[PDB]
Amino acid sequence: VLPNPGLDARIPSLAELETIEQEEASSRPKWDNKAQYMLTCLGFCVGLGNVWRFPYLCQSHGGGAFMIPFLILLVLEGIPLLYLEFAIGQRLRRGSLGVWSSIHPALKGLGLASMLTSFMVGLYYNTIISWIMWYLFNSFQEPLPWSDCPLNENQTGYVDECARSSPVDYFWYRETLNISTSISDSGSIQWWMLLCLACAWSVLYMCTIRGIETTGKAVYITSTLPYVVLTIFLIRGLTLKGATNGIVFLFTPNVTELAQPDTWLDAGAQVFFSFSLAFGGLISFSSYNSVHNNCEKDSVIVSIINGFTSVYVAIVVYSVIGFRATQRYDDCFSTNILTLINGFDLPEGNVTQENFVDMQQRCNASDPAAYAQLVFQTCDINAFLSEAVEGTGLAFIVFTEAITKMPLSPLWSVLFFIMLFCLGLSSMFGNMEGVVVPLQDLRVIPPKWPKEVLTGLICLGTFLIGFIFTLNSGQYWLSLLDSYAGSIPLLIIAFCEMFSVVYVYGVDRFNKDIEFMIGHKPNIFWQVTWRVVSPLLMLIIFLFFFVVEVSQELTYSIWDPGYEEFPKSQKISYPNWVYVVVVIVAGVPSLTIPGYAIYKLIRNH
Amino acid sequence: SIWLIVFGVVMGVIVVGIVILIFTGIRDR
Ligand SMILES: CN(C)C(=O)CNC(=O)/C=C/c1ccc(C(F)(F)F)cc1
Ligand SMILES: *[C@@H]1O[C@H](CO)[C@@H](O)[C@H](O)[C@H]1NC(C)=O
């Protein structure tokens, strides 16, 4: 609809497409088997980002409360943009940057941002992989290292932290992070974190050495194993004392959380992380298919699987949350019972859940003075369920603690980390795809050098950038990318990708060119979303981000051993200078789309 | 350190694989 001049001779034609495959068999990587393509998409869309952030987002807000908006926007906003990314990659036969520049030179900024966003999300994920494989390396010892504390200085008690906090808390915060007091208090490159980060980058380079002719062989173990281990954890998780309590807790969603703006804001941003939309990987992966591949079927299958896996993962994360919560509740009562049995010298087994409160007052009447001198913890179980996990805490504290309770603790622990490592590595394949290819298509390195040279330079580059997440304050540093800053650019790109393919390339052209490939011209559902419904939701929700998430003071939970209520999150405001850091990483890609366009409209004229 | 020896073995095998693949690439040349 916008006044585009000479779009053709800048992109492939429809009559030429018949010679983009057999004629162009070389010069472009091609999926050996549709299976190999489907596993990559399944891996990429249903990896970390769909299986890591989702439960954390659901544990926060409300259990079932946050699930409703997510599944509304998953189809009303995610399915459209996923179909639009697959079809345009399959039609124009080029990667992200190439596709946007083909539609319009100014759109190059869209691909540039997509490359930066993909880089940053890989940098983030890699660290999570490094922590996963730290934990995976320690889980080959019958008594797992986070099931106890180091003896006191006089080998008497244990570290005040470990004593006042949990063994799992001490293994995470002290033995793994050696975390400092503040983001301001920068630490040192904890050598063992650096060493695991090196292992992470090393394995990823090995699996992505030679583009897609090395990752497609990897996704045979990397997109299957994670789903054949998450159905066993489901069974194990369901087979847990009090598991069915947390499961119901998840399906009991206060409706007043569904009527809060941030809840849905954290759902929309989450849609574009669940499906790796606006990283640009998907466009490239769909461009190596047959020109006559049914991409509508692929988008719907990927979306259904991606939607259904989100709920399957919150049913495994809650079974464990209700297991731990039930245990705490039981411990609270046991302790209470013991306290009253002590002093009063009640016969052991006399007082029980069945007769606590009546024997509280009874014994009170018998001897109030003594009963008065008796602390009594409050046990609720629902309050235990309501307890919200800290960032990354759920996987390295909640799950780790539950595993220790599980029999043959080392078997499960190992399996739990091998699942998280595999669905991380899978996710990283797409993340790396979306930074290698743009960098090839800028023609930045002399094209005599092989593909392996360029893939190692970015592995080492991002490896060197990842030293900041290896300091004492690194965890705080990593929790900044869990702020709105991370989602700021994604929303801009996704909207621009939709607007460019509908009001620049032309939806009419798109409808014809889609009809040429799959056979039929897309349904009314696809028309009503792409034209108005999809753009409106995306645009309105970014405006909401500007109004809620963006309009919030930056604060972060600090782990202060020397702090009143040490075993309690200390929420403090970020120092002003970290606004500079959020201005760049929210504003570099987001202003790249406008700011390369203006460059192309002041050089031409 | 058991964790440390596990780390060592894993990194060794991974670098061996990296070398094998760079060679596979040399063969492809
Ligand atoms: C801080 N943040 C933004 C996060 O996203 C943290 N995510 C987590 O801590 C994720 C845990 C997690 C544990 C178990 C499973 C299972 F179900 F696979 F077992 C999945 C996810
Ligand atoms: C952790 O950090 C402190 C300084 O922040 C340092 O003295 C110590 O050697 C480090 N290692 C630990 C606690 O294992």
Taking the C-alpha atoms of residue A415 and residue A132, their distance in angstroms, rounded to an integer, is: 11
Q: Which residues contact A306 (CB under 8 A, 6 or more apart)?
A: A45, A46, A50, A74, A274, A275
**A455: closest chain B residue by CA:** B22
The string of DSSP codes covering A577-598 is: HHHHHHHHHHHHHHHHHHHHHH
Per the CB < 8 A criterion, the answer to whether A179 and A556 are in contact is no
Distance separating alpha carbons of residues A161 and A167, to the nearest angstrom: 9
Resolution in A: 2.8
Structural tokens at position A459: 């592995």
Ligand closest to CA A56: 1
Pocket test for ligand 2, best of A172, A174, A178 (most atoms within 8 A of CB): A178
Phi/psi of residue A460, nearest 5 degrees: -60, -40
Give the Cβ contact number of residue A411 at 10 Å: 12
List CB contacts (< 8 A) between B22 and chain A: 209, 452
Q: In degrees to the nearest 10, what's the CA dihedral of A426, A285, A73, A228?
A: -30
Which tokens hold the place of A183? 């983001």
Whether A107 and A500 have beta carbons less than 8 Å apart is answered as yes
Cβ A501 vs Cβ A529: under 8 Å: no
CA distance A67 to A427: 22
**Interacting residues of A17 by C-beta distance below 8 A, sequence separation 6+:** A93, A291, A516
Contact A145 B3 (CB under 8 A): yes
Give the containing element (helix H, strand E) for A556: strand A555-558
Main-chain phi, psi angles of A495, to 5 degrees: -60, -45
A166 lines ligand 2 (CB under 6 A): no
Q: Among partner residues B7, B17, B21, which is closest to A195 by beta-carbon distance?
A: B7
Which single residue is written with the structure tokens 């299986």? A51
Between CA A397 and CA A166, with CA A418 as vertex, the angle to 5 degrees is: 15
B17·A206 Cβ contact <8 A: yes
Number of other CB atoms surrounding residue A223 within 10 Å? 24
Q: Say whether B11 and A202 touch across the interface (CB within 8 A).
A: yes
| Cα(A354)–Cα(A346) distance, integer angstroms | 15
Cβ(A472) – ligand 2 distance below 6 Å: yes
CA distance A445 to A439: 8
> Cβ–Cβ contacts within 10 Å for residue A220, how many?
12
The one-letter code for the residue type at A130 is S
Q: Which of A274, A312, A317 to mutate to test the pocket of ligand 1 (most atoms within 8 A of CB)?
A: A317
- What CA–CA distance (Å, rounded) separates A163 from A328? 17
DSSP state at residue A399: I
Name which of B3, B19, B23 to mutate to probe chain A: the one with the most chain A Cβ atoms within 10 A of its Cβ.
B3
Secondary structure element (H or E) that encloses residue A570, with its range: strand A570-573
Q: Tell me which ligand sits closest to the C-alpha of residue A179.
A: 2
Instruction: Give yes or no for A202 touching B (CB within 8 A).
Output: yes
Report angle CA A134, A138, A140 to the nearest 5 degrees.
140
Spatial distance between the Cα atoms of A388 and A58, rounded to a whole number of angstroms: 10
Burial A12-28 (b: 16+ CB within 10 A, else e): beeeebeebeeeeeeee
Any idea what DSSP says for residue A21? S
Burial of A206 (0-12, 13-18, 19+ CB in 10 A): buried
On whether the CB atoms of residues A268 and A74 are closer than 8 A, the answer is no
At residue A143's C-alpha, the angle toward residues A335 and A164, to 5°, is 40
Q: Are B11 and A199 in contact (CB under 8 A)?
A: yes
Q: How far, rounded to the nearest angstrom, does the alpha carbon of residue A30 sit from its chain's CA centroid?
A: 28
Q: Which of A133, A138, A202 sits opposite B18 (nearest CB)?
A: A202
∠ CA(A508), CA(A514), CA(A520), 5° rounding? 100
In the structure encoding, which two tokens stand for residue A472, read together? 């004492």
CA–CA distances in Å: residue A182 to residues A73, A275, A481, A557, A572? 37, 34, 16, 9, 9
DSSP letters of A136-195? HHT--SSS-TTSS-PBPTTSSSB-HHHHHS-HHHHIIIIIIS---S-SSS-----HHHHH
Strand-pairing partners, residue A555, are A573
SS3 content of chain B, % helix, strand, coil (to 5): 95, 0, 5
Cα-to-chain-centroid distance, residue A557: 19
Over its C-alpha atoms, chain A yields an Rg (Å, rounded) of: 27
In sequence order, the 6+-apart residues with CB closer than 8 A to the CB of A247 are: A238, A315, A318, A319, A322
- Breaks in chain B (C to N > 2.5 A) come right after none
Cβ within 8 Å, pair B3-A198? no
Q: Smallest Cα–Cα separation from A241: which of A89, A405, A371, A123?
A: A405
Q: A555-558 and A570-573 as β-strands: parallel, antiparallel, unpaired?
A: antiparallel
Instruction: Mark yes or no for CB contact A206/B14 under 8 Å.
Output: yes
Instruction: Print the SS3 string covering A22-39.
Output: CCCCCCCCCCCCHHHHHH
Residues forming beta bridges with residue A158, ordered by sequence position: A151
The amino acid that residue A520 corresponds to is H
Q: Which atom of ligand 2 is nearest to the CA of A187?
A: 5
Rounded Cα distance between A90 and A550, Å, is 36
- Residues A263-302 as b or e (16 or more Cβ within 10 Å = b): bbbbbbbbbbbbbbbbbbbbbbbbbbbebebbbbebbeeb
Both tokens of residue A26? 């070389």
Helix axes A534-547, A79-92, angle to 10 degrees: 120
By what method was this entry solved?
Answer: cryo-EM
Nearest to A277 by CA among A97, A437, A80: A80
Task: Give Cα separations from A533 to A66, A105, A268, A271, A273 (angstroms).
Answer: 21, 27, 14, 16, 20
Q: Which residues of A420-453 are buried (b: 16+ CB within 10 A; e: fewer)?
A: bbbbbbbbbbbbbbbbbbbbbbeeeeeeeeebbe
Report whether B27 contacts A215 (CB < 8 A): no
CA atoms within 13 A on the CB side of A376: 14
Count the neighbouring beta carbons within 10 Å of the beta carbon of residue A239: 11
